[PDB]
């Protein structure tokens, strides 16, 4: 029977930058979630709402597997009710999260000698993000009262910084790929179960 394709989601050459975080919708299939939970590939597999120990028995309306590269320092911000540059201006999980958040170390692939500049996060945004929202915007940051006219200088900044990932870094500033399985169940027929 159709197996929900997590090989893409998990073993893919490139991950999106946390600011433009990526989201594939997994629907109509069976997937073993204990192919994941067993692995201990993962430095973090914290779960919120549900439980991993026997998870491939429940059925769900919708499964969203979001994925992106953050850094080790910030992994702890992809929790419910977190705050920081990521939970505020980049990727926000709700109060009522019901899913699991998986991450592993990523130097081997994403670090680079001379810094990897391809992964970007947001520095600046007017207000915070509503859960699961996603500003892909690159308009100049009005830090104060003066307008900008697409010219950046004092109090007009560019809103994205690069993570500048380097392989001999501290664990803290080392790449971490992150998959955020959000299992939500609605008032419609279910279409992911497992065994």
């Amino acid at each position: 029977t159709n197996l929900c394709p997590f090989g893409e989601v998990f073993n893919a050459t490139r991950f999106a930058s946390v600011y433009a975080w990526n989201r594939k919708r997994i629907s109509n299939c069976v997937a073993d979630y204990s192919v994941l939970y067993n692995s201990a590939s993962f430095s973090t597999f914290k779960c919120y709402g549900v439980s991993p120990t026997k998870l491939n028995d429940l059925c769900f309306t919708n499964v969203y597997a979001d994925s992106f590269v953050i850094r080790g320092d910030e992994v702890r911000q992809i929790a419910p009710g977190q705050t920081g540059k990521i939970a505020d201006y980049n990727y926000k999980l709700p109060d009522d999260f019901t899913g699991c958040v998986i991450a592993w170390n990523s130097n081997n692939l994403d670090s680079k000698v001379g810094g990897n500049y391809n992964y970007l996060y947001r520095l600046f945004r007017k207000s915070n993000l509503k859960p699961f929202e996603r500003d892909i915007s690159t308009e100049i940051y009005q830090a104060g009262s003066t307008p900008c006219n697409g010219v950046e200088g004092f109090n007009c900044y560019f809103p994205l910084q690069s993570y500048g990932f380097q392989p001999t870094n501290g664990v803290g500033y080392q790449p971490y790929r992150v998959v955020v399985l959000s299992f939500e169940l609605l008032h419609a027929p279910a279409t992911v179960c497992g065994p």
Partner: antibody
Framework: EVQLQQSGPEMVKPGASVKISCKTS????????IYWVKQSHGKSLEWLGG????????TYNQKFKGKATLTVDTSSSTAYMELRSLTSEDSAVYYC???????????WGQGTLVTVSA | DIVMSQSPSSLAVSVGEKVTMSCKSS????????????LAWYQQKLGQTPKLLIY???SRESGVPDRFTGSGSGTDFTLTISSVRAEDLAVYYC?????????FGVGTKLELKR
């Protein structure tokens, strides 16, 4: 309660140097921008520059640049202004004022008096 | 550089009545993105640090009485006190902020006729 606090008025031998403080308090120093305004007695107001404490960068009024230098301290929460060569035009009252996204000067500090006397 | 043009240097009329001073500007203070005009009005009573009356050309700030109202766009803005009071004695600067450097107007003084 937003409060900005300058220093005691000062008297400087001409051509020498001075530094005026500004203790901000009651809001996050890094967030909001500090401007400085010179109002010399019997005249109007004059903008002289800005500083953004977070990233530390400054903009300057053309006609004051070089002869003044804005310079914040993160820890103490304190804005600064230094006038390097004090002629007599510099005899004035310099203001330090904070900002809001809506308008340029929302909270004003006491005022320091600068008299440049030999 | 963006130099502010007020009129008139001195003004003075009796309680009640209607003062109406003006501010004009080198450059359209119009930002075509948001459609706001980048011009504020401060109320420096003497011996006091200035106090903002109108922001974005046309909006009483919180606590400011409705007898004050700004108006205008582009070049010709206008501060209007309907029915001046005794307390409304002060110099009234217009100030722009659609570009740096931030410029102030020359000042409109309100003396009071008794």
């Amino acid at each position: 309660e937003v409060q900005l606090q300058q220093s005691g008025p000062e008297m400087v031998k001409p051509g020498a140097s001075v530094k005026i403080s500004c203790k901000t308090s009651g809001y996050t120093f890094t967030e909001y921008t500090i401007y400085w305004v010179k109002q010399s007695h019997g005249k109007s107001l004059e903008w002289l520059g800005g500083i953004n404490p977070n990233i530390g960068d400054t903009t300057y009024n053309q006609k004051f640049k070089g002869k003044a230098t804005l310079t914040v301290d993160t820890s103490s929460s304190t804005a600064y202004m230094e006038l390097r060569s004090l002629t007599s035009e510099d005899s004035a009252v310099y203001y330090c004022a904070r900002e809001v996204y809506n308008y340029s000067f929302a909270y004003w500090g006491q005022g320091t008096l600068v008299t440049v006397s030999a | 550089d963006i130099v502010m043009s007020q009129s008139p240097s001195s003004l003075a009329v009796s309680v009640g009545e209607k003062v109406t001073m003006s501010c004009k500007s080198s450059q359209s203070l119009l930002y075509s993105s948001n459609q706001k005009n980048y011009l504020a009005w401060y109320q420096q009573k003497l011996g006091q640090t200035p106090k903002l009356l109108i922001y974005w050309a046309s909006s009483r700030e919180s606590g400011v009485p409705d007898r004050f109202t700004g108006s205008g766009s582009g070049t010709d803005f206008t501060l209007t006190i309907s029915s001046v009071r005794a307390e409304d004695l002060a110099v009234y600067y217009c100030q722009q902020y659609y570009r740096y450097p931030l410029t102030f107007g020359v000042g409109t003084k309100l003396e009071l006729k008794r």
